[PDB]
Design an enzyme around this catalytic site. Structure first.
Site, short mmCIF file in Angstrom:
data_model
loop_
_atom_site.label_atom_id
_atom_site.label_comp_id
_atom_site.label_asym_id
_atom_site.label_seq_id
_atom_site.Cartn_x
_atom_site.Cartn_y
_atom_site.Cartn_z
N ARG A 169 -4.11 -1.63 3.67
CA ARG A 169 -4.50 -0.35 4.27
C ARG A 169 -5.29 0.45 3.24
O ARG A 169 -4.73 0.92 2.25
CB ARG A 169 -3.28 0.45 4.75
N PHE A 213 -8.87 8.75 0.59
CA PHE A 213 -7.45 9.02 0.46
C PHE A 213 -6.78 8.02 -0.48
O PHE A 213 -6.36 8.43 -1.56
CB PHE A 213 -6.80 9.00 1.84
N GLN A 238 -3.60 1.10 -0.34
CA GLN A 238 -2.18 0.86 -0.15
C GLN A 238 -1.93 -0.64 -0.07
O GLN A 238 -2.63 -1.36 0.66
CB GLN A 238 -1.66 1.58 1.10
N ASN A 284 6.49 4.75 1.77
CA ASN A 284 7.84 4.76 2.32
C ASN A 284 7.76 5.06 3.81
O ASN A 284 6.70 5.39 4.35
CB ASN A 284 8.74 5.78 1.59
N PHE A 320 0.77 3.08 -3.20
CA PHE A 320 -0.63 3.40 -2.99
C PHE A 320 -1.22 3.99 -4.26
O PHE A 320 -0.51 4.61 -5.06
CB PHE A 320 -0.86 4.34 -1.79
N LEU A 356 1.48 15.16 0.02
CA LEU A 356 2.47 14.12 -0.17
C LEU A 356 3.48 14.49 -1.25
O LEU A 356 4.52 13.82 -1.36
CB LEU A 356 1.77 12.80 -0.51
N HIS A 411 6.68 11.58 -1.48
CA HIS A 411 6.46 10.27 -2.08
C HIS A 411 6.62 10.41 -3.58
O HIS A 411 6.13 11.37 -4.17
CB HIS A 411 5.04 9.73 -1.71
C1 LIG Z 1 8.00 6.88 12.59
C2 LIG Z 1 7.30 6.20 11.43
C3 LIG Z 1 8.04 4.97 10.98
O1 LIG Z 1 9.27 4.94 10.88
N1 LIG Z 1 7.34 3.88 10.64
C4 LIG Z 1 7.95 2.61 10.23
C5 LIG Z 1 6.77 1.64 10.21
C6 LIG Z 1 5.64 2.57 9.72
C7 LIG Z 1 5.71 2.89 8.24
O2 LIG Z 1 6.17 3.95 7.82
N2 LIG Z 1 5.25 1.97 7.39
C8 LIG Z 1 4.56 0.75 7.78
C9 LIG Z 1 5.38 2.25 5.95
C10 LIG Z 1 4.09 2.98 5.51
O3 LIG Z 1 3.02 2.36 5.45
N3 LIG Z 1 4.19 4.28 5.22
C11 LIG Z 1 3.02 5.09 4.97
C12 LIG Z 1 3.01 6.36 5.86
C13 LIG Z 1 2.35 6.13 7.20
C14 LIG Z 1 2.74 5.07 8.00
C15 LIG Z 1 2.11 4.85 9.23
O4 LIG Z 1 2.52 3.77 10.01
C16 LIG Z 1 1.09 5.69 9.65
C17 LIG Z 1 0.71 6.78 8.86
C18 LIG Z 1 1.32 6.96 7.63
C19 LIG Z 1 -0.43 7.66 9.28
C20 LIG Z 1 -0.82 7.71 10.63
C21 LIG Z 1 -1.89 8.46 11.06
C22 LIG Z 1 -2.60 9.17 10.10
C23 LIG Z 1 -2.26 9.14 8.73
C24 LIG Z 1 -1.15 8.37 8.33
C25 LIG Z 1 -3.20 9.97 8.03
C26 LIG Z 1 -4.07 10.48 8.99
C27 LIG Z 1 -5.21 11.39 8.80
C28 LIG Z 1 -4.99 12.74 8.52
C29 LIG Z 1 -6.04 13.61 8.34
C30 LIG Z 1 -7.34 13.15 8.43
C31 LIG Z 1 -7.58 11.82 8.72
C32 LIG Z 1 -6.54 10.91 8.92
C33 LIG Z 1 -6.86 9.46 9.21
C34 LIG Z 1 -8.15 9.17 9.96
O5 LIG Z 1 -9.35 9.50 9.26
C35 LIG Z 1 -9.66 8.76 8.09
N4 LIG Z 1 -3.71 9.98 10.24
C36 LIG Z 1 -4.35 10.26 11.53
C37 LIG Z 1 -3.64 11.40 12.23
C38 LIG Z 1 -3.20 10.27 6.56
C39 LIG Z 1 -3.98 9.37 5.60
C40 LIG Z 1 -3.82 9.98 4.20
C41 LIG Z 1 -5.46 9.31 5.96
C42 LIG Z 1 -3.39 7.96 5.59
O6 LIG Z 1 -2.10 8.04 4.90
C43 LIG Z 1 -1.43 6.91 4.78
O7 LIG Z 1 -1.77 5.85 5.22
C44 LIG Z 1 -0.16 7.11 3.98
C45 LIG Z 1 -0.53 7.55 2.56
C46 LIG Z 1 0.70 7.64 1.69
C47 LIG Z 1 1.40 6.29 1.66
N5 LIG Z 1 1.67 5.88 3.06
N6 LIG Z 1 0.57 5.86 3.92
C48 LIG Z 1 2.92 5.54 3.52
O8 LIG Z 1 3.89 5.59 2.79
C49 LIG Z 1 5.69 1.03 5.05
C50 LIG Z 1 6.98 0.31 5.46
C51 LIG Z 1 5.80 1.53 3.62
C52 LIG Z 1 5.87 3.79 10.62
#
Ligand SMILES: *CCC(=O)N1CC[C@H](C(=O)N(C)[C@H](C(=O)N[C@H]2Cc3cc(O)cc(c3)-c3ccc4c(c3)c(c(-c3ccccc3CCOC)n4CC)CC(C)(C)COC(=O)[C@@H]3CCCN(N3)C2=O)C(C)C)C1
Ligand SMILES: Nc1nc2c(ncn2[C@@H]2O[C@H](COP(=O)(O)OP(=O)(O)NP(=O)(O)O)[C@@H](O)[C@H]2O)c(=O)[nH]1
Ligand SMILES: [Mg+2]
Lengths: 170, 164
Positions: free
Chosen positions: B54, B59, B62, B101, B112, B121, B125
């Protein structure tokens, strides 16, 4: 002529928002969980003899990004409120989604459909009378679905389009 | 005395470059030790071979799912999950190394690297290291990402270990 509708799929993580969308769009289902960030799809359908383009926004079940959530709700014309019949918390979450949608849209009357998904599973924790009664209290339809068997999948999206059409008459 | 670990990053198997990390064992000892041991493989499992699954431009990059190989798995050296150690350190800018997480006290192996300040965050985190050398390689990795995190080629940790 044809019409076009922006549908938005919301609900707790893991309930089957993506699986439901992928069944509607691609006519298949997989067990593997691919957690959503954000995805979009277009599909041309015929509903009640009227041809329409469905623009489907598949959202992530997350509660950390309210400004993105709000824009999803501003743009969407109708919303699937999806919970899983073996996830009691996801059903307890539903009222939060309807509350936020009404707030962002500044309206008592927003096209919505309640979707009880994973109806194929033997591990039910939410009885359907609960969900039927909630949907009635909202004045919205309730549709039982399984992304795995395809039961109710077309029904959920098409019913949402009918609710949008009914809202436009007002 | 903080340990340094290295990742050799590959794109569809071809070497991209090396990224090294300082691990903040002085302030976050248990979380740094997990990442250290996962990087050496000394417990019989770890990061070598796994992917950055990912990558969202602007951002973070990961990675770290070596158990399910699909973004949903991972495990720590203490068990499947461990609690959030502390929140002393914050997501202050590019190169910060932090634990992924699924909510409170669910640290495993996924992590990440920030490519921007991600202050929302903080407190949720655990930050435990930072990029030392190879931010230019991290920036290259970020270019293989997309809006929804899907990568345009397979980004892997072809080799990894402890530097010294
Ligand atoms: C109910 C949730 C739950 O229990 N679960 C279990 C399975 C999943 C899960 O947590 N994992 C797989 C977990 C993990 O990867 N943890 C991530 C946190 C995370 C998980 C998932 O599944 C989705 C999202 C975060 C997420 C969804 C939608 C998002 C999003 C994150 C961001 C944005 C966003 C905000 C503002 C502007 C733009 C965007 C994105 C689109 O434009 C580029 N959106 C859309 C609303 C936030 C960013 C920072 C872009 C992405 O963040 C991440 O991906 C985060 C960053 C920190 C680290 N992590 N991901 C996690 O820890 C595993 C088991 C570790 C769901
Ligand atoms: N048996 C069964 N499993 C289902 C059904 N719908 C989804 N699943 C399974 O439940 C898991 C999560 O499905 P998914 O569609 O990714 O859920 P989601 O609401 O999109 N999750 P997210 O909010 O993270 O994007 C997957 O393993 C999927 O196969 C269903 O009707 N029946
Ligand atoms: Mg999804």
């Amino acid at each position: 002529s044809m019409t076009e509708y922006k549908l938005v799929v919301v609900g707790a993580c893991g309930v089957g928002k993506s699986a439901l969308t992928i069944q509607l769009i691609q006519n298949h289902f997989v067990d593997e969980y691919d957690p959503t960030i954000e995805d979009s799809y277009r599909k041309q359908v015929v509903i009640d003899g009227e041809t329409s383009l469905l623009d489907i926004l598949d959202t992530a079940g997350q509660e950390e990004y309210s400004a993105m959530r709000d824009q999803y709700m501003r743009t969407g014309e109708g919303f699937l409120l999806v919970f899983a019949i073996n996830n009691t918390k996801s059903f307890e979450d539903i009222h939060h989604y309807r509350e936020q949608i009404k707030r962002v849209k500044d309206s008592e009357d927003v096209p919505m459909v309640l979707v009880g998904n994973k109806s194929d599973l033997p591990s039910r924790t939410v009885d359907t009378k609960q969900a039927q009664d909630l949907a009635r209290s909202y004045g919205i339809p309730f549709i039982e679905t399984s992304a795995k068997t395809r039961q109710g999948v077309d029904d959920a999206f098409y019913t949402l389009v009918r609710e949008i059409r009914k809202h436009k008459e007002k | 005395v903080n340990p340094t670990v290295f990742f050799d990053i590959a794109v569809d198997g071809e070497p991209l470059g090396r990224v090294s990390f300082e691990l903040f064992a002085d302030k976050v000892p248990k979380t740094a030790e997990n990442f250290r041991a996962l990087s050496t493989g000394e417990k019989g499992f770890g990061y070598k071979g796994s992917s950055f699954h990912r990558i969202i431009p602007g951002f973070m990059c990961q990675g770290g799912d070596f158990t399910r190989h699909n973004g949903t798995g991972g495990k720590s050296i203490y068990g499947e999950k461990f609690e959030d150690e502390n929140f002393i350190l914050k997501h202050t800018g590019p190169g910060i190394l932090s634990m992924a997480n699924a909510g409170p006290n669910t640290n495993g192996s996924q992590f990440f690297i920030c490519t921007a300040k991600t202050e929302w965050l903080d407190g949720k985190h655990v930050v435990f290291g930072k990029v030392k050398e190879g931010m230019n390689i991290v920036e290259a990795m970020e270019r293989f990402g997309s809006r929804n995190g899907k990568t345009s080629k397979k980004i892997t940790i072809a080799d990894c270990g402890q530097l010294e």
